[PDB]
Amino acid sequence: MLRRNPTAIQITAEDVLAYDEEK
Amino acid sequence: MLRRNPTAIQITAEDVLAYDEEK
Amino acid sequence: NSQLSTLTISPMTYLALSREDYLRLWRHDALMQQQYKCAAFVGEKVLDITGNPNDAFWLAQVYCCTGDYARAKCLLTKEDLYNRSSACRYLAAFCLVKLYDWQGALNLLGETNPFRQDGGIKLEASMCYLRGQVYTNLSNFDRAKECYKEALMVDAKCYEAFDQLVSNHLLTADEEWDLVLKLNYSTYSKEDAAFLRSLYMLKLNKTSHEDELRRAEDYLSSINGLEKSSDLLLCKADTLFVRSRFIDVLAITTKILEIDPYNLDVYPLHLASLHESGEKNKLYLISNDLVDRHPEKAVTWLAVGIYYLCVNKISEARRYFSKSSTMDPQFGPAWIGFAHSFAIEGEHDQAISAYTTAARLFTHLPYLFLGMQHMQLGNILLANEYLQSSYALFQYDPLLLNELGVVAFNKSDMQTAINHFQNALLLVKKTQSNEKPWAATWANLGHAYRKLKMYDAAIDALNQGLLLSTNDANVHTAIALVYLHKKIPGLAITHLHESLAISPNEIMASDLLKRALE
Amino acid sequence: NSQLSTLTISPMTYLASREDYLRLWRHDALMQQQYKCAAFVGEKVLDITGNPNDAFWLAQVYCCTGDYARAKCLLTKEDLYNRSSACRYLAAFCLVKLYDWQGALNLLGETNPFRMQDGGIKLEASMCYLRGQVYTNLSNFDRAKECYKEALMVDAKCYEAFDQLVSNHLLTADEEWDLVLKLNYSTYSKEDAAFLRSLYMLKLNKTSHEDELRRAEDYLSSINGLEKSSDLLLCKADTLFVRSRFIDVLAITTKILEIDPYNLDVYPLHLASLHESGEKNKLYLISNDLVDRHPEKAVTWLAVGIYYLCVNKISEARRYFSKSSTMDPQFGPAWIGFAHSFAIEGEHDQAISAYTTAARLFQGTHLPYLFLGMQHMQLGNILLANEYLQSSYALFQYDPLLLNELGVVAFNKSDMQTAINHFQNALLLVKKTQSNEKPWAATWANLGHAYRKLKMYDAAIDALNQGLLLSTNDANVHTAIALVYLHKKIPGLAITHLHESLAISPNEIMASDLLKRALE
């Protein structure tokens, strides 16, 4: 059976917001 | 094999001429 | 070695069990039951375990039955196996042929038979047959014929080789008789040699060794079961057809088509006999479903052409005989139909072309037709050369005797003409022919009589003439002229009236008439 | 009667007469494929004797010539099929060749009519197989299954039936093992039962009965000569492929291809292993002589497709897995290839169709549920994706790709700890296998993403880095690394990595923003 590549987690737009809350 | 029909001798002008040797 | 066959190496010889015995019985039965996935899987296992050449051979059998010729060859040519086993060498060579590798075939087989009893066909013989199959495909017809006769010389049971020589008209009529006569039937059975020889004679031509053929059919006939055999029956009808006994032929042929519907060997003879018997309906019936059932066979399109013949659509019949001979250029009966259709429609050179190509296939019949054609063209030397070549073949066909008569007549040998016409009428009585065409022979006889000044015989024959075909202006003219000779102008007049009414423009009738007027 | 095979009717039984010279002669003609001759002799013996066995053998000749109507008629004429089981088998066989399905069923019966041994397949078995073939063509796949199961129970030697069951995937992995385990091998040989049984087990599901299968493989390797058998090398290769030992699979599979170049069953394993290693050249050569010599085989077009797949020509790959799976709808590998093409294009629904039709043709294996899981992740059905993933895991727990997928799921819930454990185990797994290292950059980066979530920034850097390593050019892992750096409060390092992202893809919306804030 052909195989495929592991799914890759991506940095999302929501991650940059979880950051902004550095206050 | 397909056959065909007997050839037929026919009456000829030479035949009338032949007769005309009535002399 | 190569004296033996495939039976020597069959798993069943064990009768004369290990794991490899069980597997062999199993693969063998799988092969006979055409369960090929099974036979390949068992055949692979046994081969892996033993490395035995006879296991390699049987494995290739299944690949062969599968159509995997490339694979069979590969398996057999990979380990010098073609050299360790005659059966392998045969099977590998068999595959190369199937693959069209003509040169590689010869490499296994050798260009000459290299080898010059178990119930089978000697592998030596089979290899000779394959050797001929190759030379045939290399168009080397001389050496194919020769390498096929080797086959039959080596084992008389090599009927594939025999079938090639005969159905491919690779030999003379005499060549063939000469051959089945000199076979060593002991390669079949010393005792009972006769049985096999008679069977082979059933395939040869009917009109060259009438003695051996009669003794053959006679012996086979006494054997119960064989009266139902197509080969025997088909031979009988060929004979019958040569004797113009068309009802008899048709009785046999018909029995064949009911008790064995799938053999199409019978058709050209059945179709030809129906044409003479004028059965338009049977010819319509039979052809229609032949086209419906076997559109791919030349036979069916011969049947269609022949139907258009008892219906005189000559332009169409020529069309389907053309089609029938382009499909199978080797199909003799179709070139005759073709040729005849030109003859009918007045095209001589084309008919003669088709006739002489038709003669290559196949017999007194083609030479006879070539003869009839040159006579219509008025080439009397050629007409005679052919009719003579046809008479040497068979002297008892009333049609041929009519043509010799007409040649004798045209060179003014009246007494020989009369002899020919009289014999033609004897022979015809013994036949089962349609009688209207023979009116021409009666009139011919009358014309010969007229030429010898013997006028009372002429009147009788001439009259017997139109009796068989009443709508005929020329014999009335004929009769009239014989009356003028008998100095009876009045009867000549009544007859010239009948023929002028039949053909109003007749130039000879008209002139001949004015003279009778007294 | 139907308890025997053709061996009983072989002329060669004389080994244990004019008609007897004729029969020997007809038999050898057949065997030598001189069919004009065998028909000639066979017709004369039947004319003489009227024996059913002679009608059978004459009929055989016609079948070899493809004249199936003709054999059928001959065996019908005298009501032969009623007086001979061989004649019944052969008449039915011709009827099937003629596509006459009701005819064949009239002759065979809709179920086994028969509810010692000569060495061949019991004709009783062969007729159930035939009945199986009919039911397949009427699309009663349930009755076909039963009617093919019956052949095997009747005679273990009916491998055409086994091959149909297994090839048409009419059985579940379990059903297949219970079948061969319960078969009566005395119909082969009471004393050598283990040999045939081991052969059959080699055809079966590699994972579920690892034990019965390992002694079967041992027993057969102790048999001199089988170590070079294509079927034996294939349990191994498939077993090695499950363990992701792809170089090992190629060693074996390439050896099979040299000693048996016309073996075709070897190709799916061979092809799939070449794709994994990225061997365009090898895939290219193979596909080309396959279409040259086997244009009519579905495998041929599997190979053309797999090639367009190490080459990333997805449209023409899809075309060819389409062509192959159409040529042989039972061909599982072509369906997987087909589904992957859709997955890559983002065609989720069609990918899911293809993967679900493939899960039928590969039942008892963990990969189809794996793929269904991964594709349902894409759609956002985490519940569903998890159902399918727990399902593959129950079937087989040691595939790095599956642990990665279970890890992406734990991470999508908020179970970072579990995600880390799963990622760490994929990585451990991958070290034992022989897989192309490059695709696993995503797992490393994955582990790195789990770590930043747990605010373990140094473990994250290290993992993200190892991700970046295995993939020369990834903008998203550079952005990830920067996100971590400015969490560590080192904007200067965050800045150089953001410059890399925006260079690999100058448009990324989030990389620009993360740079926006990294002004420090």
Side-chain angles (χ1 to χ4, degrees), chain A residues 1-13 15-20, chain B residues 1-13 15-20, chain C residues 1-77 79-254 256-505 507-518, chain D residues 1-76 78-114 116-144 146-148 150-515 517-520:
Chain A
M1 224 155 141
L2 267 333
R3 291 186 126 258
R4 51 196 269 197
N5 297 154
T7 296
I9 300 171
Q10 302 291 90
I11 291 278
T12 46
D15 286 303
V16 13
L17 277 36
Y19 172 74
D20 283 355
Chain B
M1 210 155 153
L2 268 26
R3 307 180 126 262
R4 41 195 288 217
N5 293 161
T7 304
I9 301 154
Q10 295 284 95
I11 285 297
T12 87
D15 283 322
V16 332
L17 279 35
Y19 175 54
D20 294 357
Chain C
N1 44 154
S2 57
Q3 297 311 299
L4 302 171
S5 69
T6 256
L7 304 190
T8 292
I9 71 174
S10 163
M12 294 289 302
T13 64
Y14 90 99
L15 285 174
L17 277 58
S18 68
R19 158 144 81 224
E20 303 88 19
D21 296 327
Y22 277 123
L23 295 175
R24 292 187 177 118
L25 266 358
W26 175 8
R27 110 149 98 60
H28 196 71
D29 183 51
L31 179 60
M32 313 280 63
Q33 295 197 41
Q34 311 174 59
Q35 293 180 199
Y36 300 120
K37 279 261 188 316
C38 179
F41 161 82
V42 185
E44 286 146 9
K45 294 314 109 48
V46 196
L47 182 48
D48 282 342
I49 295 180
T50 73
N52 195 319
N54 298 144
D55 293 314
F57 168 81
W58 289 114
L59 216 208
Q61 275 291 261
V62 4
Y63 295 159
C64 262
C65 301
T66 278
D68 283 341
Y69 307 114
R71 188 174 194 182
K73 124 85 177 59
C74 201
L75 163 75
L76 295 169
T77 67
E79 218 70 320
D80 189 33
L81 277 151
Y82 53 88
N83 264 330
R84 304 172 56 201
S85 173
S86 271
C88 289
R89 175 172 245 104
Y90 169 71
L91 185 49
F94 179 104
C95 287
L96 261 14
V97 155
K98 286 277 164 268
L99 259 358
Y100 309 114
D101 190 355
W102 310 124
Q103 190 53 218
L106 286 201
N107 281 336
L108 290 180
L109 300 171
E111 296 193 16
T112 150
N113 173 197
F115 305 110
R116 50 205 284 216
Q117 205 159 85
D118 70 11
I121 304 165
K122 302 203 196 210
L123 282 166
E124 181 184 9
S126 296
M127 287 167 52
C128 273
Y129 162 82
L130 239 31
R131 196 148 28 227
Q133 213 70 339
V134 169
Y135 282 132
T136 296
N137 284 296
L138 296 184
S139 301
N140 186 352
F141 295 112
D142 306 299
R143 189 142 56 156
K145 157 201 271 203
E146 230 46 70
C147 313
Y148 283 138
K149 288 163 61 165
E150 252 296 58
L152 278 181
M153 290 316 291
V154 171
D155 196 315
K157 302 194 261 75
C158 198
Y159 183 91
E160 294 294 279
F162 183 74
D163 169 77
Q164 279 306 300
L165 299 169
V166 163
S167 75
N168 271 49
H169 324 285
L170 258 28
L171 299 172
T172 317
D174 287 353
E175 279 186 329
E176 303 168 340
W177 272 103
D178 182 11
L179 171 73
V180 337
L181 250 352
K182 77 174 168 281
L183 263 28
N184 179 179
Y185 292 99
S186 180
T187 62
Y188 165 61
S189 184
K190 190 184 179 63
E191 30 263 6
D192 219 35
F195 177 63
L196 179 52
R197 187 171 56 248
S198 315
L199 255 30
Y200 282 9
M201 294 185 279
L202 295 191
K203 315 301 269 172
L204 320 178
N205 87 100
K206 277 83 210 51
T207 60
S208 75
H209 290 250
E210 205 160 33
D211 206 327
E212 276 90 326
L213 194 64
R214 175 189 269 178
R215 200 292 318 194
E217 186 236 274
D218 190 67
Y219 175 61
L220 261 14
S221 285
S222 72
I223 302 171
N224 26 331
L226 292 186
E227 64 280 345
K228 195 173 184 59
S229 171
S230 287
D231 297 335
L232 186 64
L233 288 182
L234 210 14
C235 197
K236 276 184 158 224
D238 288 332
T239 299
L240 264 6
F241 186 90
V242 166
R243 293 170 194 173
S244 291
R245 288 197 60 95
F246 311 116
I247 291 162
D248 287 344
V249 159
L250 268 165
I252 297 184
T253 188
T254 301
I256 291 177
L257 284 68
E258 82 199 2
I259 76 175
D260 175 25
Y262 287 85
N263 98 324
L264 279 47
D265 284 355
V266 71
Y267 279 112
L269 199 49
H270 192 266
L271 280 345
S273 305
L274 291 165
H275 174 243
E276 316 298 326
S277 319
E279 251 82 329
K280 19 167 316 167
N281 317 264
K282 314 249 212 181
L283 253 24
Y284 189 81
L285 289 180
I286 295 177
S287 52
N288 271 147
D289 67 303
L290 268 180
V291 354
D292 131 284
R293 182 180 315 116
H294 304 272
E296 79 283 353
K297 312 299 289 108
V299 229
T300 101
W301 297 104
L302 173 270
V304 170
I306 294 181
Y307 164 80
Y308 287 115
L309 266 203
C310 160
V311 145
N312 231 261
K313 299 176 181 178
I314 310 302
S315 259
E316 279 308 79
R318 174 188 309 190
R319 163 168 179 238
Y320 293 101
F321 289 135
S322 182
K323 178 178 189 53
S324 175
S325 63
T326 41
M327 293 200 189
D328 187 2
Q330 198 81 186
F331 190 47
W335 291 98
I336 290 306
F338 202 8
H340 282 163
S341 104
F342 289 115
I344 301 259
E345 290 293 332
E347 175 53 9
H348 301 317
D349 286 4
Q350 228 135 176
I352 283 169
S353 309
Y355 281 132
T356 115
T357 126
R360 308 195 206 295
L361 333 175
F362 295 123
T363 307
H364 66 278
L365 285 188
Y367 286 159
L368 202 212
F369 304 144
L370 261 326
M372 293 175 76
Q373 213 56 224
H374 285 293
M375 232 188 317
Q376 268 34 63
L377 247 137
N379 289 306
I380 316 188
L381 290 177
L382 262 6
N384 184 258
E385 296 315 88
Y386 279 118
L387 295 183
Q388 294 297 324
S389 308
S390 171
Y391 185 89
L393 266 0
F394 179 63
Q395 22 276 139
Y396 296 104
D397 183 331
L399 203 224
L400 157 69
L401 294 194
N402 183 83
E403 307 308 313
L404 288 172
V406 168
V407 180
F409 181 94
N410 287 320
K411 58 183 53 168
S412 276
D413 289 329
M414 292 315 170
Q415 194 41 250
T416 121
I418 285 159
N419 269 66
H420 283 136
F421 296 137
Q422 277 170 325
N423 298 4
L425 278 359
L426 269 340
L427 270 4
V428 157
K429 282 158 190 174
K430 304 162 102 67
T431 68
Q432 292 173 151
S433 328
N434 169 211
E435 308 128 52
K436 282 213 171 188
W438 301 105
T441 311
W442 280 109
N444 285 340
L445 182 59
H447 282 115
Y449 281 142
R450 202 223 325 154
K451 273 283 196 320
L452 282 195
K453 273 77 140 310
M454 58 215 269
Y455 304 121
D456 284 338
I459 290 303
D460 182 71
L462 277 170
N463 259 280
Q464 185 62 46
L466 44 49
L467 214 138
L468 263 5
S469 74
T470 61
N471 45 309
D472 209 284
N474 187 262
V475 358
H476 284 281
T477 304
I479 290 157
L481 170 62
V482 172
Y483 274 130
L484 298 185
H485 283 115
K486 285 170 69 68
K487 305 140 179 294
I488 316 185
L491 289 169
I493 292 163
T494 57
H495 273 278
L496 285 161
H497 282 323
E498 263 294 334
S499 73
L500 276 175
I502 293 182
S503 171
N505 312 75
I507 332 84
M508 291 170 311
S510 199
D511 283 16
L512 208 47
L513 167 42
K514 302 306 186 304
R515 309 167 190 270
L517 270 345
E518 304 297 41
Chain D
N1 206 352
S2 73
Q3 301 313 290
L4 301 174
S5 65
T6 58
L7 297 188
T8 280
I9 311 178
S10 178
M12 293 298 289
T13 58
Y14 90 102
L15 279 176
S17 192
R18 149 145 87 228
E19 311 75 61
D20 287 323
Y21 283 114
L22 263 36
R23 293 178 180 134
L24 267 15
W25 178 15
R26 166 197 68 199
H27 203 63
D28 179 68
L30 231 190
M31 240 72 283
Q32 293 201 234
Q33 307 177 88
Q34 291 173 22
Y35 297 130
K36 281 263 180 293
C37 170
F40 179 70
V41 180
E43 292 156 4
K44 269 105 220 65
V45 202
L46 181 56
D47 289 335
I48 287 169
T49 64
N51 199 123
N53 294 172
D54 293 329
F56 168 77
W57 284 114
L58 208 217
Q60 264 286 255
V61 178
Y62 296 163
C63 280
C64 295
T65 287
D67 279 72
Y68 296 114
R70 189 178 209 197
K72 182 226 84 259
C73 196
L74 175 78
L75 296 178
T76 286
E78 202 89 25
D79 102 312
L80 261 319
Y81 52 89
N82 257 32
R83 303 150 49 198
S84 178
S85 309
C87 292
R88 192 171 224 101
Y89 173 74
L90 193 50
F93 179 104
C94 289
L95 240 18
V96 159
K97 285 295 179 185
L98 258 7
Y99 304 117
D100 196 329
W101 308 123
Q102 176 51 234
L105 245 24
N106 288 332
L107 266 199
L108 269 12
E110 305 212 40
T111 68
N112 184 13
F114 316 102
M116 62 292 305
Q117 278 181 27
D118 65 20
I121 321 311
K122 296 196 178 194
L123 281 171
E124 181 182 354
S126 298
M127 295 192 277
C128 286
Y129 163 75
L130 231 36
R131 234 203 322 291
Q133 286 283 60
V134 165
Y135 278 138
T136 299
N137 284 288
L138 302 176
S139 309
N140 321 15
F141 305 104
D142 15 68
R143 226 135 103 144
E146 297 301 333
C147 315
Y148 289 141
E150 233 209 328
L152 269 185
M153 301 302 293
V154 173
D155 190 315
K157 300 191 309 304
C158 198
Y159 173 105
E160 288 289 309
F162 190 55
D163 174 60
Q164 283 311 294
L165 286 161
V166 166
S167 274
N168 280 330
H169 304 285
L170 269 26
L171 295 201
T172 63
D174 279 346
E175 290 173 314
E176 276 163 4
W177 279 94
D178 162 279
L179 177 60
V180 341
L181 254 22
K182 106 207 211 75
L183 247 46
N184 173 16
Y185 291 105
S186 297
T187 67
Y188 160 64
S189 148
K190 191 229 157 190
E191 124 182 355
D192 194 41
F195 172 79
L196 176 61
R197 175 160 37 77
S198 307
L199 256 32
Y200 282 2
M201 290 172 6
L202 294 196
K203 293 315 192 168
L204 267 19
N205 188 276
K206 235 55 58 173
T207 80
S208 45
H209 296 246
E210 209 138 317
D211 11 279
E212 288 103 331
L213 198 86
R214 70 163 170 63
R215 45 172 159 284
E217 195 287 316
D218 230 33
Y219 181 58
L220 269 6
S221 279
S222 78
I223 310 290
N224 174 54
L226 286 185
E227 70 289 331
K228 301 165 193 303
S229 177
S230 148
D231 295 314
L232 191 256
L233 286 184
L234 268 194
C235 133
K236 296 163 191 295
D238 255 306
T239 298
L240 264 358
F241 189 86
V242 161
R243 287 165 202 171
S244 303
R245 314 267 303 152
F246 304 116
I247 303 167
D248 293 342
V249 177
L250 282 170
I252 276 172
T253 213
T254 296
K255 192 182 188 181
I256 298 190
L257 247 6
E258 26 181 279
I259 92 197
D260 190 359
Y262 297 78
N263 182 324
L264 251 28
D265 297 330
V266 81
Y267 280 109
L269 249 343
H270 189 242
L271 267 357
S273 294
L274 290 169
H275 170 263
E276 148 86 24
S277 309
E279 315 258 14
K280 339 181 314 78
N281 181 225
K282 297 205 188 307
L283 254 4
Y284 186 77
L285 306 169
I286 290 155
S287 32
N288 280 145
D289 72 292
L290 279 183
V291 334
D292 186 33
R293 71 192 33 225
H294 301 293
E296 78 292 340
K297 303 302 293 168
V299 225
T300 287
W301 308 100
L302 201 243
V304 175
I306 288 171
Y307 165 65
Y308 286 121
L309 220 64
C310 158
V311 136
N312 243 276
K313 278 176 160 288
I314 307 302
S315 327
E316 35 280 288
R318 178 147 80 235
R319 146 159 219 20
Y320 288 107
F321 296 126
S322 192
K323 189 185 160 67
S324 168
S325 70
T326 288
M327 275 183 268
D328 186 356
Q330 244 65 35
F331 200 36
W335 283 101
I336 291 313
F338 195 34
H340 290 164
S341 300
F342 286 119
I344 270 129
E345 280 336 67
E347 224 104 37
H348 311 309
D349 284 342
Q350 307 208 56
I352 289 147
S353 293
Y355 286 132
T356 66
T357 128
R360 195 259 281 194
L361 311 168
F362 278 118
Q363 210 66 111
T365 103
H366 81 293
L367 283 180
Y369 291 160
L370 216 179
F371 301 150
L372 261 344
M374 296 172 57
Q375 207 58 221
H376 279 293
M377 275 194 268
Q378 306 295 296
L379 293 181
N381 319 343
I382 356 71
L383 170 112
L384 207 56
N386 185 51
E387 291 265 36
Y388 286 115
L389 290 174
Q390 294 302 323
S391 288
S392 7
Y393 188 81
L395 259 11
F396 179 72
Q397 46 284 103
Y398 306 103
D399 170 355
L401 208 208
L402 170 66
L403 296 173
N404 179 274
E405 306 304 314
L406 280 162
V408 170
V409 147
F411 175 100
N412 279 323
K413 331 213 176 191
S414 269
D415 193 357
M416 296 311 161
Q417 177 58 352
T418 301
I420 277 150
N421 301 153
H422 279 146
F423 300 139
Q424 275 167 172
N425 254 90
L427 275 358
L428 299 213
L429 251 344
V430 164
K431 256 296 191 182
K432 310 171 202 159
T433 81
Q434 306 175 127
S435 25
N436 180 193
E437 195 173 358
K438 180 148 193 303
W440 303 106
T443 298
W444 275 110
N446 287 351
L447 180 70
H449 275 112
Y451 281 149
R452 46 175 274 275
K453 283 283 136 314
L454 287 184
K455 303 180 161 310
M456 315 187 187
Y457 299 121
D458 291 339
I461 283 305
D462 179 73
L464 269 321
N465 279 0
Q466 177 82 31
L468 189 49
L469 229 132
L470 277 330
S471 73
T472 284
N473 77 309
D474 215 61
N476 190 275
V477 4
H478 276 278
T479 299
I481 291 177
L483 180 45
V484 169
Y485 273 122
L486 71 227
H487 270 129
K488 302 168 62 55
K489 294 311 208 83
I490 311 185
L493 291 188
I495 279 153
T496 52
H497 276 277
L498 255 11
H499 285 302
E500 282 299 326
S501 290
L502 296 173
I504 294 128
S505 68
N507 345 64
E508 185 69 343
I509 94 285
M510 49 181 19
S512 294
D513 279 357
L514 251 12
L515 186 63
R517 290 66 155 304
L519 51 297
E520 279 62 282

